[model samples]
Target: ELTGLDEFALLAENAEQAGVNGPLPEVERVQAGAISALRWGGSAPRVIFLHGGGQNAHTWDTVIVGLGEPALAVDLPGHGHSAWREDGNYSPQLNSETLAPVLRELAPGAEFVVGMSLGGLTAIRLAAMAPDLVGELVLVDVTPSALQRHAELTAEQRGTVALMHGEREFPSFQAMLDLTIAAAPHRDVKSLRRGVFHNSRRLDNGNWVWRYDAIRTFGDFAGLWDDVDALSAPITLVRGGSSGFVTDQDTAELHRRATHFRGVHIVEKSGHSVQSDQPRALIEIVRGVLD
Candidate 1:
């Protein structure tokens, strides 16, 4: 007897009452003109999951269900249902600032912060600036010294940004789905189609456009490593077992930069996006860390 939003709400309530996992969540806007998140659970140990570029909060749906812990998967500004910033500064500092108030309200007692790609970078900044809200940090398929080690990786990622920027609107949903599948061949086709639906909206002109502000999302990451050495929170670096982005050598470099770096966990048979490709494995790793 539940509609779309209500169904997710009930699922969250059930997880809190029964101490178990639940269904995918519904969007909830937090703070005024701030971020929107899919909140799961009620009073359990709070955790926050942040998705990569061009992805919405729903990207963590499977992972959240598998973890069965109180968690919030947030849409970074300009993505999902969150209000796009006029300044277009999607840097970690700006995003961390935007997320601080929400985290304080949702998880005042400190919570685990897990992020991938751009989100991972933002988590690092959050841990650095607002250590009180963060219990631990789990970075998926991203390294603090990533840009330094792999210059080509930046170009590749930048190309994606450029592609999204250039092609704001698609002729049809199928076209967007095709582009997404091409970009992430490792991901399932059904999932990609779902993403196209979640991430795009049809305009009055009968064309679908991305919800994320691709142009503004790109920022200079050279300074990201400057503050990594100062972070005191416990950190874990997770790599997609098949992702070339975070190599064994890069993992070693992250440990070198982070004094509190715990260790590394690599999810097998996954690419750059471990959550979509191997959510169960990601969940097991997260559950292990929580335990």
Candidate 2:
């Protein structure tokens, strides 16, 4: 019988067979402020993609393939192969500061920066903090404030809180996969399985645990856009049409603060996880922005 790793590898191969074809990018562990990233492309006008909370760089696999361009997807602190923050400080400002030097080394003049959810928060800070490094910014399915009033977001936060605020172990990999699929049901089961496998680690006792830092909580994100006015690069917001996080009111407020705001594009059939649920549509949006 194939072990979990072997089964995961088979599922991954199936993902490629389904037309998601791309070679593995070079994995680099940069220490400027600590990050583990998958680097793609060798030339200039590079782009970087930041995945959402509870996700890793691999989330952009299909999108990157569809873009057919060189990009970097980083595993933020407290997630993926990167080291977790000791003070539970996953604030965008702190993450942006830590990532500045790493970006300086990897892609000195990166043209476009795309971030989703927590990643979007960090991208906002990066654009404002290091305006010289980014040419443009793309915020996906996230705004600068807490999604307090959104019922979907309330459930999301509660689930994350339960995961982080309590036990970090699960009885089986299927338990983790079930939770993941319930949140983003549009994703293919095979793809979700592969992702869950990579996101978890099995201990000697046979229980499985997440690779992410459980001590971290998604805190109040009310004043996250305090520095939006300082961003020099043009910014665009991509919203999942079915998602409640980026409402019409949020867009208006975003434009008010970000004078450099370009426009908003909505992926009609998708929820919050647009990259996985509607990657082709998201890629088309990204292509328009970059090319």
Candidate 3:
């Protein structure tokens, strides 16, 4: 089981993990953080992992390392350790449009792609634009059909994000950690904490801020289905068995619309957070598709 430090353990662990790893690498002109992708000398087909809305590149931390290739994760503009656009164009299509140039510059030769939620949509659009550069696509818990519940899902997503920005702060890191533990299994507590730290940013006054654009939910960005069908490469869609974002009806519709190659997988014991909720299960699914 992953370590679940009582509230007392949160601060110490955060400092330790953060200090143990020196400064994180930064890329210029990329508008976002790119990992394992910038200067890898090895010739492994790059496996680029992308996180969903209100999530950062580290959202793929544990499962990311296990992808078994030169893996790269991105803090898409306005999310995670990246810059936010005040204008707030956070749609998947917009994100992909902005991200294509970055990926091309970072790893023009990358062949494998992995993405979740908003990231999945971004991956689809990017692949369509440059199908040859992308060989395999992994859509972690997302599909066009998932958009059918846009109103309810968007409200839930936005509500949670608002909570993050509300005038409340955990006095200690442990307090914050505790909140995650309540929602997650004990074995995944530590891993989830690590990812959160990576996703947090220090404000000018020293408070930590989530790196997501609030305007993502303010607009009607759904119904961009043409982009979904534009992709010509094989895509593997992974869904959390208990995900509210991707229900049985959504999955069924996805099967009907995703005429491309590849397949769908539902990881058990996982909620919306399939990777963290059930890491081992997710790793198995990744192995089948990536290997």
Candidate 4:
């Protein structure tokens, strides 16, 4: 049995924390398992958010609330309320296939696509696969060569994601929190607590596990840079000041290969999960692309 906060109910808390004034836009969870997404507002979506691996659509809640514009935040298969695949292979190429058709129906005419980490890689593939669905591209703290780029992104820098590295299950919420804090000492405990609750769920055994099944997606992604070379849409990169996911070498390769590189912008205060560390900062980046 699962027990915790309701997904829709948490949006109010995010809105209040951001000090958002005026009425909040309509937020709806659209579709089922194949691929699930949160539709914000009633108008046609101007932007689509693809969260990182091990992350769900709600990771963009704060940013979406800040923007107060029509947007779509997708929960790629194997994460969030989305259904997991039987094969358990969540390659960027495969993820693009699942998302392409969804975008075609939910957001025709190719909306601006913003992706973080794993989602960034998937966005690259998506753009290459369906240029019409992703008009503009933004990579947040991730590159196709992320894993093989520099040094292995140590567990300490990634914090909560340490769960994907084999700590996916915990006996209690406190146990999970303690381990999470030890690995990522820089994150706000309150924020991390909310994150833990949102991304994890309780089991009948009183243990907890992450909602995403991205552990296997950590394989080599060096070959996918070809997708970047094939992209026709404008591409902008958001590198976190302290995040080690994307290296200078990786950026160099991106610049060398991108067909229409829009260049990179550094979010001076954020990390790999730019949206999580500084949602508003991410909102500004998305605004520039969407506008």
Candidate 5:
């Protein structure tokens, strides 16, 4: 029932909340259908944001607002307004292929490409698969080795990020909001409400449903380590201090295999979704390449 929400309605609020002083940049959703993205600023994009599984382009809303720069926040295929693959194969390898043409066309020689969680994994592949498209790769809270061996994580912590959770369809918007609030107890109710609005839709029957497709990823995850080894652009890993998604050993392995490793950054008081929990801190990390 939360209709008539303008995509950019929250930009001013986000910028103000983040204490960002720059002028508000233009924002729009572009390249609808097979691939969709939120394009911020009229100038060509130098920064790219790929949200995690179950998240859309708007996941980077606050970050983009904080930076107030030309950036591309893409809704990975099957998420947000983008087209879903009938195969539902949302693996890093195939996702990179699907993304190559789009990035090459929209943001060639992008200086900073930031991907979080699933998107972080995909950026590793994208940098390897098409190094020409990315100048520097920033992986946020995900590495090929992350979450694969999280005996350290509780079921509740891990379950929150399992993508599809509880009921995919809810009787009302409030019910959908309840599911996410329970799942992400750390996130504020106001932010979660905004995220749910952009990430879900109303059925003709009036129930609510998440916009992302229910996926069974069969993409070559094992070979993603090879993709890490294969990067031409220097890569950096950003870990959330309060999150179990990435381990110190994982960062060591990344630096070990990658000749162009830039190093790892840890954001305090943040979980796996560092962009969501601490967008300003994440913005500072990505701002490193702006010069």
Candidate 6:
């Protein structure tokens, strides 16, 4: 019932706005409840972007516009106007499976996938379950072993997540950005101020709240590990130098289990959000892998 613009049509509009021209990938509603994503290039291998917890399709605003290959960014179920799964099946397996019909329909020649944090975990699981369907997998600042190795992260982080997800209203757009910035203790104030602010509409009383679903993500984090083992693609893991999520120990184990896991690159002076902290570095890494 939520269907609006055709995915390809939207992609055309986006390309026109960006002042870039490329082939339009096919679009089809392969199954009920499956969201058809807009495609960018037909000649280049397709790349899909999945944002971290609590982020939406707009999360890639700073990066993809400058990126080279053809790709797509998706708002997961219940995140940014995407359908929510009411069956309590938001596990990694469910996330992986959710894209099957879409994959079958689009069938990009050797699609590449990149995901940040929760998104990374889901991408890996999806790749592992159907390795042939993936060309490459990029896991940004997360791995299955990250949780076990980082003793510094605890129930506090979980509680903080709960607060954001539980929030019925954000005092202001600044409030939402502030919480995200607070999570990264290592970023500079200037950078934080410049990078994180988002424009959102004020509610009935002319008060602002984040446009995306904050609570659903907070509630979804606990069970994300349910299906990570299903992944086995060539993985490039990027870690923030100051990140608590991907520890050294976790990185080692990731190499042990993954079929083609690359060594972790800890970009200096960065924190939880690897892409924002070092966009240039992130781009170089992606280009190197894709090459």
Q: Highest lDDT: which candidate? A: 5
Worst 10 residues of 1 by lDDT: 1-10
TM-score of 2: 0.84
Q: Each candidate's lDDT (Cα)? A: 0.73, 0.74, 0.62, 0.79, 0.81, 0.59
Candidate with more favorable, higher TM-score: 3 or 5: 5
lDDT of 6 at 213: 43
lDDT of 5 at 7: 73
Q: For all candidates, what are the clash counts?
A: 0, 0, 1, 0, 0, 4
User: lDDT score, residue 108, model 2?
Assistant: 80
In order, what is each prediction's RMSD in angstroms? Answer: 4.8, 3.8, 6.5, 3.9, 3.5, 6.5
Q: Point out the worst 10-residue segment of candidate 6 by lDDT.
A: 1-10
Write down the TM-score for model 4.
Answer: 0.87
Question: Which structure among the candidates has the greatest TM-score?
Answer: 5
If both were scored by TM-score, which would come out higher, candidate 2 or candidate 3?
2
Query: Tens digit of lDDT per residue, candidate 3, span 128-192?
Result: 77776787888888876575455455677666766574535434456556665776655546676
Residue 268 of model 6, lDDT score:
80
Q: Write the per-residue lDDT of candidate 5 for residues 56-93, one digit (tens) a residue.
A: 99988888888777899998988999898877777777
- Which residues of candidate 1, in runs, are more than 4 Å off? 1-31, 43-45, 147-167, 216-223
Candidate 6 local Cα displacement, residue 196, angstroms: 5.8
- Against the true structure, candidate 1 has what lDDT? 0.73
Q: Cα lDDT for residue 24, model 2? A: 39
Which stretches in model 5 have alpha-carbon errors above 4 Å? 147-167
Against the hidden reference, what TM-scores do the models get? Answer: 0.82, 0.84, 0.75, 0.87, 0.90, 0.71
lDDT of candidate model 6 versus the reference: 0.59
